[PDB]
Design a protein around this ligand. Sequence first.
Ligand SMILES: *[C@@H]1O[C@H](CO)[C@@H](O[C@@H]2O[C@H](CO)[C@@H](O)[C@H](O)[C@H]2NC(C)=O)[C@H](O)[C@H]1NC(C)=O
Ligand SMILES: *[C@@H]1O[C@H](CO)[C@@H](O[C@@H]2O[C@H](CO)[C@@H](O)[C@H](O)[C@H]2NC(C)=O)[C@H](O)[C@H]1NC(C)=O
Ligand SMILES: CCCCCCCC/C=C/CCCCCCCC(=O)OC[C@H](O)CO
Ligand SMILES: CCCCCCCC/C=C/CCCCCCCC(=O)OC[C@H](O)CO
Ligand SMILES: *C\C=C(C)/C=C/C=C(C)/C=C/C1=C(C)CCCC1(C)C
Ligand SMILES: *C\C=C(C)/C=C/C=C(C)/C=C/C1=C(C)CCCC1(C)C
Lengths: 296, 296
Amino acid sequence: RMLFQTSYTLENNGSVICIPNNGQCFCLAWLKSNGTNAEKLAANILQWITFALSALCLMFYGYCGWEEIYVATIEMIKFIIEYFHEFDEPAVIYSSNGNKTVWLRYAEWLLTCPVILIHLSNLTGLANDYNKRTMGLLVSDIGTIVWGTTAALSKGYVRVIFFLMGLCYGIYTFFNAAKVYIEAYHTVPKGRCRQVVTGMAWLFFVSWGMFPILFILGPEGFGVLSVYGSTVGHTIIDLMSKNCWGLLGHYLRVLIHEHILIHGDIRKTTKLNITEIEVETLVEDEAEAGAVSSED
Amino acid sequence: RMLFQTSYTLENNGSVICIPNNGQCFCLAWLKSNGTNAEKLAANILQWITFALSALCLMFYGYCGWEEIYVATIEMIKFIIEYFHEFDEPAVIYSSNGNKTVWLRYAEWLLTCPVILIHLSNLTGLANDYNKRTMGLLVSDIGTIVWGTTAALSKGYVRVIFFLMGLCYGIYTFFNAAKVYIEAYHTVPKGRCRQVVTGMAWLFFVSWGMFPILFILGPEGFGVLSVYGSTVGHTIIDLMSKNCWGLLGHYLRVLIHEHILIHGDIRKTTKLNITEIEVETLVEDEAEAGAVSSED
Ligand SMILES: *[C@@H]1O[C@H](CO)[C@@H](O[C@@H]2O[C@H](CO)[C@@H](O)[C@H](O)[C@H]2NC(C)=O)[C@H](O)[C@H]1NC(C)=O
Ligand SMILES: *[C@@H]1O[C@H](CO)[C@@H](O[C@@H]2O[C@H](CO)[C@@H](O)[C@H](O)[C@H]2NC(C)=O)[C@H](O)[C@H]1NC(C)=O
Ligand SMILES: CCCCCCCC/C=C/CCCCCCCC(=O)OC[C@H](O)CO
Ligand SMILES: CCCCCCCC/C=C/CCCCCCCC(=O)OC[C@H](O)CO
Ligand SMILES: *C\C=C(C)/C=C/C=C(C)/C=C/C1=C(C)CCCC1(C)C
Ligand SMILES: *C\C=C(C)/C=C/C=C(C)/C=C/C1=C(C)CCCC1(C)C
């Protein structure tokens, strides 16, 4: 099917390659198989199921709330492109050093990272304002993806360096994301809302932790995984990272706003020490509205 | 110098290209000259002068304030890479459809866009908090760059579509950036500070407006500009966009903080109508501290 040169002849006992003078790019590296038919079959099924979850989440959100819809919007447009041109440039970049770079993956990441990280900075949906910490999260995360994308396009020691630079930015991101979730947990009402925040923390760190793991394992790293293999891995953590997390988000938001509808905005002053942090604890009792220094 | 195949023989009256079977990538498209020696000379001079401004701004900032230093930090690291490997992959991506994509340019943009846009949302340096508008600026701007990078990697009608998607996100960004500058102007003290804000608005819209212009003019568009030609253009708007703007930023910040040191934080309530906006006008008179509905 390809729109680079696929047809060639070996000459002088395979010391010379002859190609038609048709102006097409040529590299043997590009023509390596993308994997087994079993890997491909598994990947096409998980993609449809991802399309289905993306489709149902959107209609569901149809019944504030912009971050979840957008990630499903970007996710559906992703599947229509995958369906028609998953292995066409520039969904994959076939480059001069022989690399295959899945631009489709990294593009989606850069697009939605501020959406996800704004949503991280707005779990309750009650804030109209964002602290200095939000801004450090966005700067560090975008650096991470830019270094990582550079690492995927590179080879040898240059790939190693950009990966290392991605990891250092990433560590700063994970550290600060942890404090946000801690604050969120002690902010929301004591019941179901704290189960959902806990659910979102698990989904976030496991799914986000799996991306640098799949980088090292894929063609961009030590080439352990095939391309279809990588796609299957990506579909699973994609479902967790995007659809499910925003669905849990929307659910949390509903619970919090309904708390204001029934009990009202009854905040507290839980002074944490996990340092010298502070928090506004929503409670279901009007009585409870004082300073609770819970030094952790 | 190149690390793709540069040496080939024409066979059967130029209907066949023969290349050594050494596993190197090959495309005639990659081997087109990057421009005249005059263009190259001009580009190397402006780069050194950019290195010099980046170097002096950093030492100058050495005598809160993190956004300006970082853009100069990223800018210096950029020049050391340019000096050694400006036309080596992945500073340039040479891809299977024959495109040259200046990844070095787009990477820097993605890295510093949250830094610049946070700084846009913090001209005075007095805010500890960021409004909902900041977040829309970051989402729209990152979309713009991701669509544009996709457009640069693509060809034909797919390049047209991604450019159009970049422009639509871009328009939303420019619209909202305009409101920020309006708010900033009517927030800062009446004297020198409003000259600097006005200076920053001009630099921002002219420099940022010139990027989609240089895209359309370069190899990524209608190929009017050569590669060295594009580099020269980029150096000029780079100096404006990064060094100069952050220097004017730092200067503004100094002026505002010194206002708190002399007069103190004396805010007002200028209710604008350019809609139904509001602003906290810093003044040098303790007397002045009331609601001034200045409907524009
Ligand atoms: C054609 O080139 C091939 C290179 O593979 C040569 O085949 C091999 O020759 C070397 C001997 O120098 C052996 O070590 C290998 O075991 C051979 N086979 C393979 C599969 O590598 C072959 O000798 C060359 N023929 C001519 C006429 O030069
Ligand atoms: C070698 O191929 C070239 C293709 O350029 C042929 O040269 C041209 O031939 C056509 C005639 O069909 C003319 O229209 C052009 O003006 C010729 N010159 C150029 C520079 O394009 C040439 O005929 C071929 N030779 C053989 C033996 O097939
Ligand atoms: C914050 C979450 C915690 C979890 C974070 C996950 C840690 C994964 C890192 C592994 C280090 C090993 C080095 C990896 C270097 C990758 C670059 C590479 O593959 O290099 C190609 C090689 O040079 C040519 O074959
Ligand atoms: C907000 C600031 C205001 C200023 C904003 C600047 C506007 C520039 C747009 C021009 C439209 C013309 C169409 C440009 C399409 C670019 C894609 C392209 O070059 O297409 C390649 C072609 O298909 C193969 O040769
Ligand atoms: C589409 C949704 C999500 C959540 C995408 C997330 C991507 C990452 C978390 C990537 C992380 C990286 C790290 C931490 C370091 C190596 C380079 C990566 C970009 C792969
Ligand atoms: C390094 C500093 C700056 C300010 C870089 C800015 C880059 C842009 C403003 C790019 C804008 C684009 C637009 C508006 C639409 C087409 C695609 C572009 C990414 C080139």
